[PDB]
């Protein structure tokens, strides 16, 4: 039998992962009836034969491929380089290329000047010597046959796809550089090749991470659907009867909303909610009961919230859109009550993004409205390993480069009012902007901005120059703020990811009390951020959390139960001399003992900086005072940390002139 | 000095004149009251008779 | 106070578009034609055939002390093929007990009527409204229509065949089970065969048991064909509700229509081959296939129209698929360019050093080869196949920027190369604009008489592209004069004469395929030049074709102007000789370009256009007659302000389709030059190696499962939109109780985007169906194409629409729905309101006749638009107004429209719901249908229901209204002390079609609402001479019936035909 | 990216391969759509110019 | 694949990487060869539940316990 | 103004943007009479005093 999964499988590590039971499929007899079939090489022949044809002729080649009839290819050296590798050893020589040929090569003369060697050679072609002989320029629908066919294909060029490819010559002569299978195969790219080869159902094309891997489904679906084999992860469990980190499992819930505020069971709307975590939901211990999201005040229970904003946004079952709750308890629609009833796919993903490549600060950018009080106090209260995930302690508000400024910006953009012809007062302003329905007019935000960009360009923009320089100089932080031009205009340093609630932000703006000013100037003066701001689809803002939380979790699963001296680790700016040793935090690492064993005897020689430290002890318990260090040099790439081990994102500088001090590494 | 300089834009593309996302480039709506359809339609035909010659 | 206005912010947040196209389009109409996606035809269900289930409401008193627990089958954990309680009954739920293969995204799940299911109601076109609880009354009949067109699209599955077993057990004669396939197996079997338990009890369900007929349990009919192999079909008897007993079946009957063996599969591929390539098919008794791939021509035409009109005016969506008939025809084609013909020719001619004039390197700068004229060449020979929808015309920069001079040579060598690159483009203008070329040249040395003094003799001979433009002297021989003009006399005769003549070749086939072109007659190929078929298969060198003729002609041509010396005096004897030496060389020049053209390319066209993504559309090559030049061709898709025939309509309401081309003329004429054969090549091989790896695809097998699901769509949306607005297709109308809405375009608009949404996320085509007719009014729409020639007269194709199995089952559905409205959640009649108080245990969904009025009850006030209220003063009573302009006080028997109550809802209330309460006032309001819920109550206690009649009534609102609460009692066991209840709210005719049983686990119902198992549903089980198949589908639905199962395989094609050589 | 892609729909760029990225272009529908060599390498830029410029 | 596995013996044979004596790779089609199967039961159906589980179903369809 | 708010007619340029789709082309020396016309007219939310 054979199964296709959309995942990169191998023979030697897809089993040690765990991959069917990673899908949901229950084999759990170990049994070792499942042999796979290492798909690397097939997907790296795709991606530099996607280089040379048309992806409908490669898709089309490769699906009507047997993957049970084992074939290799064999390729040659050209054919003015041929002749000289039969040349040398002439006993190698296949009976078929000619009687007055090969008395002609087994000789042992130089043959320098060739009278009729030269014609026996011009005449010489290498397709009536080796039978399949498949191009340089074959259309490569026929490669698929051909290897279906035979065991041992000839060719004479790079581009194949569907086998392995051995050389048949040593490696001098070139220019351009079995099996266990026991009935059970599974591994991706399907086959319509033969009846008994299925392909796995649950997980959409839409949410496939590979990418070639989507590629190649979204083409098998789209053609061929009605001839295909979509089973169940049951139907599949039913037929069958270095741990590393930033890997999670995800499904996506299948809720509903439901009031019963007359005594009376009723379904009103219908939900869906996109990549969850699955060690969240084993850990909150979500089943299938009725939920209430409501405590006592009108405020989510917090793991509600902890759960939407882990993930990404919401979708209308009925109408596939976007959707976004309402926060406020005043209904046009309020969630009071739900009903969780089941979970459709059972991917993977990457915690880890694209866009992290170096160990250097963060910036996070959200409209005004978000939850942000909120999820700060839900993220200060984690502690995992003894070490805090993410402290408030060096984390910045949005308003913080807002509030030091001493015509105070918010109070400064408060007095716009008396440039406008003909408002002169604030109330009036918020009046006459807006419609009495809270959707604005474009005309006087236009004019409004217009009288507004002055006042964020220029008294803004080097205050914040100064205020993220220095705190870029007192650590490595997280900088939340708005309207992403305001980490583009002033020069920021640092990771940025635009970010998004799943909540309507603009209904928030005026539920909260006793804010600064009206709570009608506090949505003028969000629309005008969100005016100001760039046209960049932003993200949701799950992926954020998802790096924060959900690798800890995998690690305390996996050393939750060694020692702390032997498994924890440290690493910072270190000074060799000693006046009135020392050492500053840069990073913490939780580890098992092989990998620690591991990060020791790396080259942590090899980045050095600037060191001052200052003399303002602060309220902290042991005897360490507050310092400041600047990187000069290329900065820490996240590769020479790990991908295996676990270590803490942003941290702070605390250990006077300069130093010069280089980093090292340090554990128990 | 001269790499902290940076337009101010007084009439920029209003949020509802895109389209969401098709991998990380959202599209300029054609019922757009802003000026820069004229850019789309220049630099869209432009492409189209580029990519449309065998040079 | 500032806190309403968060209400208005977050309705105007709610009121965003569901569907709205405000992005362009034409990056997936170019990927429309190239590639579409299949839909998902065959689905598999290895479940159970039903969609009504059977919810249990209140459970039953079990412990009660007038009879003791050990009479229930309760106390025994016996396995119920019916839920024993003391009210049960029956929600419609689809695919509540079937385990599918792949599910559609879309369902039809109702509550029990205890519960509210107002958002089925609202949740179509009602966004305005703002409780949560209300729906429009005015918009019930769209909701009704889109949940019907839901229940059909669920149930479009076929029954699969699994795994019987055979009892042990006595209950059954050795009767033959069935197994389905799930985690928990076994609760299924008590409610599949409800014939299969023993009879204990005088429960009603024991009773109905044995009143049942004992033979008829499982297995009774099979098909064996091949020994160890699996049965081809059953006929089970088990619990399946026959209406989608018959969907199904309708829907197997259509895959069934569209069935092909792979006999006829080789066959149609050996005649598309043309013998070039062969495939191979078994002989032996196969054991089943089902693969629907054959469809009729109506579809292929409909189809054709659509895309027809999808692609229009546009000019880059239509230049990929030339480029893919291109390079496509790249790899098939034998000859590639020689290299070095044209400079191994000119030196056999030569001349004298002394003059600064060369023609050889005047053509060795005016010409270019460079392998870039090769592909422009071939997307001119694949132009040929669309003349109907692009014309390939010559860019205006091959042309000499001046009209040219015949004093010059370059302007010569100008005029050879046009008058060489013109045949071969489709645009019909190409003799005028030949002609005018040398008109062009000859300015002062001959005039001609033109048409007028603005389209003069001297203007550029691009500008004409048009029959009307075509000068008089060239259409009248006579006027021009051999002593006034010997040269364009002759090149007229020459151009009248000797011009390529159109020819054909018959490709594709119509058995499997579809024809699928429109003007022209069925399966055949236009080309502008002639065809003949090769005697040979080496090919040589001849001159017998046509266009070294026509080159010959042309450089007859060229001699007799170069010959004469008052055309160019300034040229000696040298360079004149030299001219007329590469001349007549070049006259004989040898090629096997033309004799290509004429013998093998024609061939290879009949191979291509069948593995073709657009198949091709045509209008007839007109040679040079200018009474039947094509001017114009047009589709329409919409009737035009009353008329409802399209041969009427379609004279002023088609949509003019057709771009040209411009390409250029030194790309045709190189290629047309040079061209060579390979040195040892034998075309059988030759072809036969090349076409092979062209016929191992199924794409154009997907394209015609793509072409079935489009004329299916466009039929159900017309017989959708006519239930609500006025159309011409005479469609039946099952639903005008339900109130509807006074449609507009705006919302039939909108209701077609809905049927789409539906449509697409049923069969999970991604890409666009049915939006090339959303984008006008879709209440008047029809599908057409015609063209028109330059005398007047036209030519009109108006295809018929084929039947439809998915608006078949929706016009059923509403049928059934017609006398099973009870089961989907609505009451028809009307509600009357009034204090009734009494001890009597009957149901208010089916009242006595007592309480009932009509318009016909003597002495009862109907009130309508003429109605006001004035009030009462010093102790008389407070009047309203009749509709025939009288007062009345506040008592009798009222009749409302509900729209009164609903347009003055607050000022009626405080007035009437004083006198509703306490005072002798009964009022009905019509509404004709409603939805509903219950309330049950225990009759042994005093019970009033003026909280929910009162809330009920505050809630009506201008927008909507909620569900009807009515307040029914509990049906008991044993006898019962009675108590007083209040009731306000009464049905007006019967309603209690969607009870099941009452006190199923007991001997007998004293108390309340009677009602046995319903007999008349299980006809087979009561009935002993009965026939298996017989069902009364539009009265009842029966609940059981004989099923049939299917075990056929799908296999691909390639694993059937396989074709190894 | 919405210029190229008619005229160049499956054909690939020097080096660089045909992808596939997935579209919410049309409010109602979200699929994933077969991004062609010339618009790939515009996804790629595009991800440069949005992050702006680091100078050393 | 049975005729696989056969050719694939009679390499193993004598002295073989391909063989001169196939079972599959046949020029004659014959896309009907219905082998034995474990798919198919005796009577007509499938066999993705083995017959003694189905029967132990279709007798604990009803069973009937004590009175309380 | 008045007329503006009772009137029940919303004006919505996507009836000319989906019939014409406005970037068509033809004879690619110069502009397509769709493009002409969309550019000339410029339908888009705008005043319509």
Redesign the interface.
């Known amino acids: 039998a054979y199964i296709a999964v959309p995942a990169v499988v191998d023979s030697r590590s897809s089993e040690a992962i765990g991959l069917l039971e990673s899908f949901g499929v229950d084999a759990g007899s170990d049994a070792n009836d499942v042999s796979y079939q290492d798909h690397d090489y097939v997907v790296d022949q795709l991606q530099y034969m996607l280089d040379g044809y048309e992806a409908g002729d490669v898709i089309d080649a490769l699906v009507y491929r047997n993957w049970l009839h084992h074939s290799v290819y064999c390729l040659l050296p050209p054919k003015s380089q041929l002749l000289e590798y039969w040349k040398s050893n002439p006993s190698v020589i296949p009976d078929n290329v000619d009687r007055r040929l090969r008395k002609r090569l087994m000789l042992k003369k130089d043959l320098r000047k060739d009278d009729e060697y030269n014609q026996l050679a011009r005449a010489f072609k290498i397709s009536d010597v080796y039978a399949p002989l498949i191009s340089s320029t074959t259309s490569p629908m026929t490669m698929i046959q051909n290897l279906n066919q035979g065991e041992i294909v000839y060719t004479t060029t790079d581009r194949v796809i569907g086998a392995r490819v051995l050389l048949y010559a040593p490696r001098k002569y070139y220019a351009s550089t079995r099996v266990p299978h026991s009935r059970f195969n599974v591994g991706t790219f399907p086959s319509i090749a033969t009846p008994k080869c299925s392909v796995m159902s649950g997980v959409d094309i839409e949410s496939i991470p590979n990418e070639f891997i989507k590629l190649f489904y979204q083409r098998v679906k789209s053609i061929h659907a009605n001839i295909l084999n979509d089973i169940s992860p049951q139907i599949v469990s039913d037929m069958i009867n270095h741990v590393d980190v930033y890997r999670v499992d995800v499904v996506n819930v299948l809720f509903e909303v439901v009031d019963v505020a007359d005594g009376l069971r009723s379904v009103s709307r219908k939900l869906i909610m996109h990549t969850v975590p699955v060690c969240i939901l084993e850990l909150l211990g979500i089943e299938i009961a009725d939920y209430c999201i409501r405590q006592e005040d009108g405020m989510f229970t917090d793991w509600f919230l902890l759960l939407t904003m882990l993930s990404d946004g919401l979708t209308d079952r009925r109408t596939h859109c976007q959707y976004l709750i309402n926060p406020s308890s005043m209904p046009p629609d309020v969630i009071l009550n739900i009903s969780i009833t089941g979970f459709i796919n059972r991917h993977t993903i990457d915690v880890m993004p694209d866009v992290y490549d170096f160990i250097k600060p963060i910036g996070a950018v959200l409209p005004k409205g978000s939850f942000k009080s909120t999820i700060m106090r839900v993220l200060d209260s984690i502690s995992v390993l003894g070490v805090k995930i993410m402290p408030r302690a060096h984390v910045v508000d949005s308003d913080e480069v807002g509030e030091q400024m001493e015509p105070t910006f918010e109070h400064a953009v408060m007095e716009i009012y008396k440039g406008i012809a003909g408002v002169d007062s604030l109330d009036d302003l918020t009046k006459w902007v807006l419609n009495s329905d809270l959707v604005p007019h474009d005309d006087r935000l236009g004019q409004l901005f217009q009288a507004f960009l002055p006042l964020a360009k220029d008294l803004l923009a080097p205050m914040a120059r100064q205020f993220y320089d220095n705190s870029m100089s007192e650590g490595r932080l997280l900088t939340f703020a708005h309207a992403d031009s305001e980490l583009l205009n002033a020069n920021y340093f640092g990771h940025l990811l635009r970010l998004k609630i799943p909540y309507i932000t603009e209904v928030n703006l005026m539920i909260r009390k006793n804010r600064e000013g009206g709570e009608l100037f506090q949505l003028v003066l969000s629309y005008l951020y969100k005016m100001y701001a760039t046209s960049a689809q932003p993200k949701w803002f799950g992926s954020l959390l998802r790096l924060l939380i959900c690798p800890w979790l995998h690690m305390e699963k996996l050393i939750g139960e060694a020692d702390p001296a032997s498994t924890s680790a440290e690493i910072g700016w270190h000074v060799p001399r000693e006046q009135l040793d020392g050492f500053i935090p840069y990073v913490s690492i939780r580890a098992p003992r092989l990998v620690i064993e591991e990060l020791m005897e790396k080259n942590w020689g090899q980045y050095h900086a600037q060191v001052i430290v200052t003399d303002q002890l602060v309220v902290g318990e042991p005897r360490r005072v507050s310092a400041k260090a600047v990187i000069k040099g290329n900065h820490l790439p996240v590769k020479l940390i790990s991908r295996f081990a676990c270590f803490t994102l942003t941290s702070k500088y605390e250990m006077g002139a300069a130093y010069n001090a280089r980093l090292a590494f340090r554990s128990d | 000095q001269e790499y902290t300089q940076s337009p101010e834009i007084k009439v920029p593309i209003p949020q509802k004149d895109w389209t969401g996302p098709i991998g990380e480039i959202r599209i300029l709506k054609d019922t757009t009251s802003s000026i820069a359809r004229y850019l789309y339609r220049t630099w869209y035909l432009a492409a189209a008779r580029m990519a449309a010659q065998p040079r | 106070e500032?806190?309403r206005?968060?209400?208005?912010?977050?309705?105007?947040?709610?009121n965003h578009?569901?569907?709205?196209?405000?992005?362009?389009?034409?990056?997936r109409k170019?990927?429309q034609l190239?590639?579409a996606?299949?839909?998902?035809?065959?689905t598999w269900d290895a479940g159970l055939c039903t969609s009504f289930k059977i919810v249990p409401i209140v459970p039953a008193q079990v412990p009660q002390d007038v009879l003791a627990?050990?009479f229930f089958t309760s106390?025994?954990?016996?396995?119920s093929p019916f839920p024993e309680a003391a009210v049960s009954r029956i929600v419609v739920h689809t695919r509540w007990a079937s385990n599918v293969?792949?599910d559609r995204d879309s369902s039809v799940i109702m509550?029990p009527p205890?519960?509210?299911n107002?958002?089925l109601f609202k949740?179509l076109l009602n966004t305005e409204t703002?409780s949560?609880?209300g729906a429009n009354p005015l918009m019930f009949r769209a909701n009704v229509l889109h949940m019907l067109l839901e229940f059909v699209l669920d149930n479009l599955y076929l029954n699969r065949?699994?795994?019987?077993?055979?009892?042990?057990?006595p209950?059954t004669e050795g009767a033959?089970?069935r197994?389905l396939?799930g985690?928990d197996?076994?609760?299924?079997?008590?409610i599949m065969y409800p014939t299969?338990?023993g009879t204990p009890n005088v429960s009603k369900i024991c009773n109905f048991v044995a009143s049942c007929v004992r033979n008829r349990v499982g297995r009774f009919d099979?098909a064996?064909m091949?020994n160890?192999?699996?049965?081809e079909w059953?006929d089970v008897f088990e619990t399946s509700d026959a209406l989608t007993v018959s969907i199904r079946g309708r829907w197997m009957a259509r895959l069934a229509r569209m069935n092909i063996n792979?006999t006829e599969i080789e066959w149609a591929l050996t005649e598309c081959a043309q013998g070039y390539v062969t495939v191979?098919?078994?002989y032996?008794?196969?054991?089943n296939r089902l693969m629907?791939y054959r469809i009729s021509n109506a579809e292929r035409q409909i189809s054709q129209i659509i895309r027809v009109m999808n692609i229009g005016?546009?000019?880059?969506?239509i230049?990929?698929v030339l480029?893919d008939i291109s390079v496509l025809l790249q790899?098939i084609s034998p000859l590639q360019i020689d290299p070095t013909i044209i400079s191994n020719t000119m030196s056999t001619v030569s001349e004298s050093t002394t003059q600064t004039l060369s023609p050889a390197s005047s053509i060795l700068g005016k010409l270019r080869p460079s392998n870039?004229d090769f592909?422009?060449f071939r997307v001119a020979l694949a132009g040929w196949l669309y003349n109907g929808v692009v014309t390939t015309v010559i860019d205006?920069s091959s042309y000499p920027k001046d009209g040219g001079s015949v004093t010059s040579l370059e302007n010569l060598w100008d005029f050879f190369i046009l008058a060489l690159a013109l045949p071969l483009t489709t645009d019909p203008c190409a003799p005028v604009k030949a002609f005018m070329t040398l008109a062009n040249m000859m300015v002062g040395f001959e005039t001609i008489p033109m048409d007028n003094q603005i389209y003069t003799q001297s203007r550029r001979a691009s500008a004409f592209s048009t029959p009307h433009t075509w000068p008089r002297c060239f259409m009248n021989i006579q006027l021009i004069s051999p002593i006034d003009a010997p040269i364009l006399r002759q090149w007229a005769e020459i151009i009248h004469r000797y011009w390529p003549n159109p020819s054909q070749i018959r490709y594709g086939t119509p058995n499997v395929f579809g024809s699928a072109n429109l003007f022209t007659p069925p399966e055949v190929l236009l080309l502008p030049i002639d065809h003949q078929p090769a005697n040979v298969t080496t090919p040589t060198l001849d001159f017998t074709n046509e266009l070294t003729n026509w080159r010959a002609r042309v450089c007859e041509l060229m001699k007799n102007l170069v010959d004469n010396q008052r055309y160019q005096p300034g040229w000696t004897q040298s360079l004149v000789s030299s001219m007329r030496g590469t001349l007549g060389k070049l006259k004989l020049i040898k090629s096997m370009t033309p004799m290509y053209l004429q013998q093998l390319a024609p061939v290879e066209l009949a191979v291509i256009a069948p593995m073709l993504p657009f198949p091709p559309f045509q209008v007839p090559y007109v040679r040079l007659d200018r009474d039947r030049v094509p001017t114009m061709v047009g589709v329409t898709r919409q009737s035009r302000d009353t008329i409802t025939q399209p041969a009427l309509s379609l004279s002023t309401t088609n949509t003019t389709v057709g771009?040209?081309l411009?390409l250029d003329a030194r790309a045709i004429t190189v290629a047309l030059l040079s061209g060579k054969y390979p040195p040892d090549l034998v075309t059988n091989v030759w072809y036969a190696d090349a076409i092979?790896?062209m016929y191992?695809?199924?794409?154009v097998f997907?394209n015609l499962?793509r072409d079935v699901i489009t004329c299916e769509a466009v039929q159900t949306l017309v017989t959708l939109v006519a239930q609500i607005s006025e159309t011409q297709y005479p469609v039946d109308r099952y639903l005008d109780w339900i109130p509807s809405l006074r449609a507009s375009a705006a919302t039939a608009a909108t209701f077609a985007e809905w049927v789409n949404?539906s449509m697409?996320?049923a069969f999970?085509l991604?890409?666009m169906l049915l939006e090339p007719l959303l984008?006008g009014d879709p209440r008047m729409t029809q599908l057409a194409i015609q063209y028109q020639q330059y005398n007047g007269r036209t030519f009109n194709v108006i295809p018929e629409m084929p039947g439809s199995v998915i608006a078949d089952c929706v016009q059923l559905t509403a049928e059934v729905f017609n006398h099973e409205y009870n089961l989907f959640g609505i009451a028809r009649g009307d509600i009357i309101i009034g204090r009734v108080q009494s001890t009597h245990l009957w149901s208010p969904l089916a009242p006595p006749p007592d309480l009932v009025f009509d318009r016909d009850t003597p002495g009862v006030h109907i009130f309508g638009r003429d109605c006001r209220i004035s009030f009462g003063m010093n102790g008389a009573a407070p009047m309203i107004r009749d509709e025939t302009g009288m007062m009345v006080p506040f008592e009798g028997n009222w009749i409302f429209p509900l729209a009164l109550w609903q347009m003055n809802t607050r000022y009626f209330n405080q007035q009437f719901d004083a006198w509703i309460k306490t005072g002798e006032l009964r009022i009905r309001i019509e509404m004709g249908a409603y939805p509903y819920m219950l309330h049950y109550y225990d009759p042994r206690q005093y019970a009033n229901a003026w909280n929910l009649t009162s809330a009920w009534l505050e809630e009506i609102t201008p927008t909507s209204i909620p569900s009807v609460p009515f307040m029914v009692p509990i049906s008991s066991d044993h006898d019962i002390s009675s108590a007083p209840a209040v009731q306000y709210i009464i049905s007006t005719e019967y309603n209690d079609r969607s009870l099941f049983c009452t006190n199923s686990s007991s001997p007998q119902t004293i108390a309340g609402p009677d009602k046995h198992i319903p007999v008349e549903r299980y006809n087979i089980l009561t009935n002993p001479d009965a026939p298996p198949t017989q069902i009364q589908l539009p009265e009842v639905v029966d609940l059981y019936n004989v099923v049939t199962r299917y075990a056929y395989?799908?296999?691909?094609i390639?694993?059937?035909v396989?074709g190894?050589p | 990216h919405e210029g190229v892609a008619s005229s160049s729909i499956g054909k690939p760029f020097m080096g660089v391969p045909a992808s596939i990225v997935n579209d919410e272009s049309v409010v109602g529908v979200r699929a994933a759509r077969p991004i062609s060599g010339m618009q790939n390498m515009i996804q790629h830029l595009s991800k440069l110019y949005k992050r702006g410029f680091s100078y050393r | 694949d049975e005729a696989d596995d056969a050719t694939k013996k009679q390499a193993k044979d004598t002295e073989k990487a391909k063989a001169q004596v196939t079972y599959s790779d046949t020029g004659i089609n014959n896309a009907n060869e219905l082998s034995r199967s474990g798919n198919v039961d005796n009577e007509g159906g499938s066999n993705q539940k083995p017959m003694s589980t189905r029967i132990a179903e279709a007798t604990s369809a009803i069973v009937s316990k004590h009175p309380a």
């Open positions: 500032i806190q206005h968060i209400t208005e912010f977050i309705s105007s947040w709610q578009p569901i569907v709205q196209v405000s992005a362009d389009v034409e990056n170019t990927a190239l590639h996606d299949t839909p998902r035809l065959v627990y050990t106390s025994y954990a016996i396995q293969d792949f509550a205890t519960e509210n107002i958002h949740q703002l949560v609880r065949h699994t795994g019987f077993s055979q009892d042990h057990t209950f033959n089970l197994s396939p985690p197996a076994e609760k299924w079997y008590s299969r338990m099979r064996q091949m160890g192999a699996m049965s059953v792979p191979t098919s078994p032996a008794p196969s054991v629907p005016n546009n000019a880059t969506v230049q990929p480029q790899r870039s592909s422009s205006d771009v040209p411009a092979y790896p191992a695809d199924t794409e997907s499962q949404t697409k996320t999970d991604s890409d984008s395989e799908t296999p691909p390639t694993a059937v396989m190894v």
